[PDB]
Design a binder for these strands. Structure first.
Length: 218
RNA sequence: UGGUUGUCGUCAGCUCGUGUCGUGAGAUGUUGGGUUAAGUCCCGCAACGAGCGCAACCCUUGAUCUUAGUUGCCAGCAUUCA
């Protein structure tokens, strides 16, 4: 935790005052997070995840900030989960049935590549379908398998993910968020007080969630 | 009066499903940054996708191939006014 710079929160000027129950002192116009709480928070979350994984849950890892794109992919894949690391599509869950059309289409344009319909009707048509396979292999690349609604989210910087958070909260699905000092901690069900704006920081905290999925898999 | 004629005939962009925002009328999608002859296309983006119109569909022509060689063709052979 001290290792990565988790403790190091954001600037003092642009903070959420609902956060100071996880803040421990400032330095150089920047709040610092009390890791003692994070210890006891990462705890509850590890438990929460593993209590959800063994039920038969699915977790979506939503981190489209530059610092958390690789982590979210790699860590979701490691724990055979889902993820969004490019853009959360307005209505991923609230309009899931429409996103289920594209989760189809994509797989079907992938089947056209397999069976052999890309040397039948070529010219404009196959260029079109490949460039459409790629739009769907950018945006729906991680929820590609997601069959039923995710049963919890793992959001990173829930201020960038305002739109993810509000879909989750609409459908009464919990949200395990890595919250900074500039984040409303009431939206998030399982808060994890940490820096989200460092790559090492995220990469550590993301790992432990996927660890709890793999610990119930064993 | 029917019907048929002249005469404002391309000239402009319109919408939907689901989702979301709004008490609501509404909004978004379809305001953004480029780009195109364009009602174009790509990137965006709380939207994700689609429809209509446009264009196409029908007819004609430019290249080629396959099938069909007769009453059409004669290159290469016999004839010859042909």
């Amino acid at each position: 935790l001290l290792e990565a710079g988790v403790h190091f929160g954001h600037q003092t000027r642009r903070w959420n005052p609902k956060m100071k129950r996880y803040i421990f002192t400032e330095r150089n116009g920047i709040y610092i997070i009390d890791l003692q709480k994070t210890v006891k928070k990462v705890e509850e979350a590890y438990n929460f995840t593993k209590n959800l994984a063994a039920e038969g849950g699915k977790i979506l890892f939503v981190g489209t900030k530059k610092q958390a794109q690789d982590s979210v992919k790699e860590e979701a894949q490691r724990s055979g989960m889902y993820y969004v690391n490019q853009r959360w599509l307005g209505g991923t869950l609230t309009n899931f049935e429409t996103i289920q059309k594209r989760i189809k289409r994509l797989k079907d344009i992938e089947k056209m590549q397999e069976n052999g319909t890309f040397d039948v009707l070529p010219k404009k048509e196959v260029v079109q379908l490949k460039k459409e396979l790629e739009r769907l292999e950018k945006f729906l690349g991680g929820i590609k398998d997601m069959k039923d609604l995710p049963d919890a989210l793992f959001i990173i910087d829930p201020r960038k993910e305002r739109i993810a958070v509000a879909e989750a909260r609409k459908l009464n699905i919990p949200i395990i968020g890595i919250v900074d000092t500039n984040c409303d901690p009431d939206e998030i069900d399982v808060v994890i007080p940490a820096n989200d704006d460092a790559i090492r920081a995220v990469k550590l905290l993301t790992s432990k969630m996927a660890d709890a999925i793999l610990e119930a898999k064993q």
